[PDB]
Ligand binder design. Structure first.
Ligand SMILES: *[C@@H]1O[C@H](CO)[C@@H](O[C@@H]2O[C@H](CO)[C@@H](O[C@@H]3O[C@H](CO[C@H]4O[C@H](CO)[C@@H](O)[C@H](O)[C@@H]4O)[C@@H](O)[C@H](O[C@H]4O[C@H](CO)[C@@H](O)[C@H](O)[C@@H]4O)[C@@H]3O)[C@H](O)[C@H]2NC(C)=O)[C@H](O)[C@H]1NC(C)=O
Ligand SMILES: CC(=O)N[C@H]1[C@H]([C@H](O)[C@H](O)COC(C)=O)O[C@@](O[C@H](CO)[C@@H](O)[C@@H]2O[C@@](O)(C(=O)O)C[C@H](O)[C@H]2NC(C)=O)(C(=O)O)C[C@@H]1O
Ligand SMILES: *[C@@H]1O[C@H](CO)[C@@H](O[C@@H]2O[C@H](CO)[C@@H](O)[C@H](O)[C@H]2NC(C)=O)[C@H](O)[C@H]1NC(C)=O
Ligand SMILES: *[C@@H]1O[C@H](CO)[C@@H](O)[C@H](O)[C@H]1NC(C)=O
Ligand SMILES: *[C@@H]1O[C@H](CO)[C@@H](O)[C@H](O)[C@H]1NC(C)=O
Ligand SMILES: *[C@@H]1O[C@H](CO)[C@@H](O)[C@H](O)[C@H]1NC(C)=O
Ligand SMILES: *[C@@H]1O[C@H](CO)[C@@H](O)[C@H](O)[C@H]1NC(C)=O
Ligand SMILES: *[C@@H]1O[C@H](CO)[C@@H](O)[C@H](O)[C@H]1NC(C)=O
Ligand SMILES: *[C@@H]1O[C@H](CO)[C@@H](O)[C@H](O)[C@H]1NC(C)=O
Length: 268
């Protein structure tokens, strides 16, 4: 289970439907993808050695995205999906592009990062809303079996991942835009000296700072929420979620900046 709150007992089972897929794709930082711009700094026409939380060059990813219909499995809320956060993660996220009429919509899995996932501890949540990325860090009363839904196509379950009837204490709450037409989003999430850091991009490029947050405590677990729809499967549209994740480590990178301040190259 994630949290401990009994939000539902509708259509829960114990079926071993899947395990996380391992990517054929591997981390290649030679053009800056898998690196980040350093905080609010601008570096112009230079190379720096910088020590930071980076993926290993040549590492695989685990796809932690889970697509449901009516049922959820209790085995989806355990190892290997419920994951130790350690130092942090780099993720590559497919923006799942859906059409209701001719109009386009963007869906992808929410990620939650936390420790015990109960309302005496802060949980960070990163969730898309069709071109808006909502991010929060709150004392959420997380469900036992949390999940999100398609807003675009229908869902035979309601959205249910926390049960707070009035808004919990939040250290952070902010929204960021992303290009709805992109094929991929990328994120870095890490912790250093009790401070959390987040970065994103909506292109094959170095990730840009979202926010940083002092927690004092260690985050210890992260989990990628199941998403339920009457869509996004082989018998209806052949479309899929993908939420690829690879671990970070304290690591030294060369970063090359051009005269505009764009990272053009990097080395592990
Ligand atoms: C912060 O997070 C915590 C932890 O999740 C929340 O605390 C839980 O809150 C819920 C909702 O109030 C509590 O659930 C309720 O517990 C009552 C007592 O349980 C005992 O008695 C029942 C029989 O009545 C036994 O079966 C059980 O084993 C216990 O011995 C129940 O009486 C309540 O029953 C109602 O709900 C159930 C389920 O929907 C129905 O079947 C019943 O008919 C009835 O409608 C209910 O189960 C839970 O116990 C709390 N846990 C703890 C550890 O405190 C906090 O609420 C949250 N705080 C904030 C600010 O959000
Ligand atoms: C994490 C995971 O394993 N995810 C897969 C999912 C689950 O294994 C399945 O939900 C059972 O999970 C549990 C916990 O029991 O199966 C999916 O495929 C289904 C067949 O397996 C799909 O074709 C569905 O077939 C139906 O017969 C039915 O009800 O399952 C009719 C329904 O309308 C139709 N769904 C549509 C059209 O979206 C799905 O989607 O649900 C593809 C997902 O990648
Ligand atoms: C961040 O984005 C979300 C999603 O668009 C906003 O949530 C909406 O807020 C209004 C407030 O009146 C509600 O009526 C809607 O029902 C909410 N939508 C959803 C899907 O929850 C949120 O207001 C935005 N801003 C901030 C600072 O969180
Ligand atoms: C969860 O709540 C439902 C609805 O009240 C109840 O039927 C079910 O027995 C509960 N299960 C547990 C494990 O508390
Ligand atoms: C689930 O199925 C996979 C594939 O057969 C297997 O590797 C795994 O050990 C099974 N059990 C669990 C609890 O994951
Ligand atoms: C960029 O740096 C190189 C090496 O020092 C130098 O030759 C070049 O003139 C610089 N250009 C600008 C625009 O700073
Ligand atoms: C979803 O929400 C609606 C409206 O509150 C409710 O009627 C329904 O019972 C809920 N649950 C499911 C599984 O649809
Ligand atoms: C949005 O994404 C598409 C596909 O990558 C790209 O062609 C388009 O130029 C992008 N537009 C903006 C405003 O970023
Ligand atoms: C999904 O793709 C397979 C392979 O191309 C095809 O056989 C099947 O008919 C497709 N189904 C849908 C709903 O597109």
């Amino acid at each position: 289970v994630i949290g401990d709150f009994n939000c539902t007992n509708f259509a829960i089972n114990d079926l071993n439907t899947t395990v996380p897929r391992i990517s054929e794709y591997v981390v290649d930082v030679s053009y800056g993808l898998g690196t980040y711009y350093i905080l609010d700094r601008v570096y112009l026409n230079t190379t720096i050695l910088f020590t930071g939380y980076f993926p290993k060059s040549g590492a695989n990813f685990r796809d932690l995205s889970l697509k449901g219909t009516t049922y959820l499995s209790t085995l989806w809320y355990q190892k290997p999906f419920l994951s130790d956060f350690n130092n942090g993660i780099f993720s590559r996220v497919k923006n799942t592009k859906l059409y209701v009429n001719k109009t386009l919509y963007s869906e992808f899995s929410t990620i939650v990062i936390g420790s015990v996932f109960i309302n005496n501890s802060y949980t960070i949540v990163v969730q898309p809303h069709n071109g808006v990325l909502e991010i929060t860090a709150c004392q959420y009363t997380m469900c036992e079996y949390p999940h999100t839904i398609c807003k675009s196509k229908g869902s035979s379950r309601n959205e249910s991942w926390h049960f707070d009837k009035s808004e919990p204490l939040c250290l952070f709450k902010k929204n960021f835009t992303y290009n709805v037409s992109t094929d991929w989003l990328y994120f870095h999430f890490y912790q250093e000296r009790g401070t959390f850091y987040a970065y994103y991009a909506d292109s094959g490029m170095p990730t840009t700072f979202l926010f940083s947050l002092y927690l004092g405590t260690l985050l210890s677990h992260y989990y990628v929420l199941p998403l339920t729809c009457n869509a996004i499967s082989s018998n209806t549209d052949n479309e899929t979620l993908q939420y690829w994740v690879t671990p970070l480590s304290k690591r030294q990178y060369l970063l090359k900046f051009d005269n505009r301040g764009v990272i053009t190259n990097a080395v592990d």
